[PDB]
């Protein structure tokens, strides 16, 4: 799995969007569930290329975003 | 569907978050369909082991919620 | 055809497109036609509910009648 | 919802039908209400592959007649 | 978890297990519990079906009774 | 990577290859840059099984080859 997986990530208010090459989902997904609450992500959803995530409590949209960026 | 499906419930200003193990999301989301717009629900969307459930206008998540535990 | 398509609503975080079981994903392929300079952010279908969410600029509102207008 | 299948073939074991991205659910829901008195053992589908199963007292070739029956 | 599980049957290549709806991939993992050495090759579960296939050293029959078994 | 691809057998019916948890949409896609020329039917994948069947006057063992050369 290599960066070449991830297309492309952008946020709004409510979720920080992932969005990767076909089929690549669940498995740049699985990367972000490593993380986890404490530090930042209270959840996340892949679909086939498309990635929503969404910040826990004390956490802004934008502060999910920054650490995605560190994890990947 | 047993009560060991779900793993966590925890949410935020946009969703609730509600963790099950690696394949019962779609099963557990199926009881969350249950339910419709009138109880708060707009949506629900399962991924593998991730369930993301929003709220309709007039309900908040705090409430989504609420209603989810006691479904549950 | 259209009629998989039950019903369009929102809220403050995104819309939800519910679908007949299994149509998800290939309406939620439809929303993909369209792409950030026209509000959609990006858009997950799981069985029969696709979440779409708005770009910076728009809004839940002009992302949901851009949805009716694409349909 | 006929373009959406592209493809429909078999072999000594299954049924292997193609179709267009995210329509595999759907094509598949559709051979779901045959079932076993029909031939199908079972039917799943991927993202664009369904791979179906004629059942004990039944051919591939015979279920690939049928599916195209319902088709 | 077993009411879940709607039927099982089986032919000359693989075991249909039939669950309700979303069930599929989690009576799949329990089947993935199993592996190679109790003559399962590997799983796959759609949404609502799973098809598994022996290993070399067993046949259909024997899978669907060692799947009877887990159940 | 294919380092995501786990394992790979065969039967008498299909090739089965065992990759990391949620890989088995993306590889399945790379034995989608084949087909039939090369010998495959279809190939149907779960969220870390992967089933490929060989298709007309090819053989699973001539596949399972192949799916390694393609590895
Ligand atoms: N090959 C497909 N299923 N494409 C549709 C994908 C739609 C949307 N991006 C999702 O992840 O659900
Ligand atoms: N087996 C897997 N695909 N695991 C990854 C899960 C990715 C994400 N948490 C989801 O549930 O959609
Ligand atoms: N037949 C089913 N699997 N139903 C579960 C649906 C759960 C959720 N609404 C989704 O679309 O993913
Ligand atoms: N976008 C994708 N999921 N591509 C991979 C498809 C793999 C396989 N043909 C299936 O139907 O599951
Ligand atoms: N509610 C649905 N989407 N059902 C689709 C069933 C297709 C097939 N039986 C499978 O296991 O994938
Ligand atoms: N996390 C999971 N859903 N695991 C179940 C996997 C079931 C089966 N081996 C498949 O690939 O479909």
Excluded: C, M, W
Aim: proline share 4%; no cysteine; hydrophobic share 45%.
């Amino acid at each position: 799995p290599l960066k070449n997986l991830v297309l492309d990530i952008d946020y709004n208010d409510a979720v920080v969007v992932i969005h990767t090459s076909p089929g690549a989902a669940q498995l740049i997904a699985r990367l972000l569930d490593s993380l986890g609450k404490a530090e930042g992500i209270l959840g996340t959803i892949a679909g086939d290329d498309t990635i929503f995530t969404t910040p826990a409590n004390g956490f802004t949209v934008k502060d999910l975003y920054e650490a995605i960026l560190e994890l990947f």
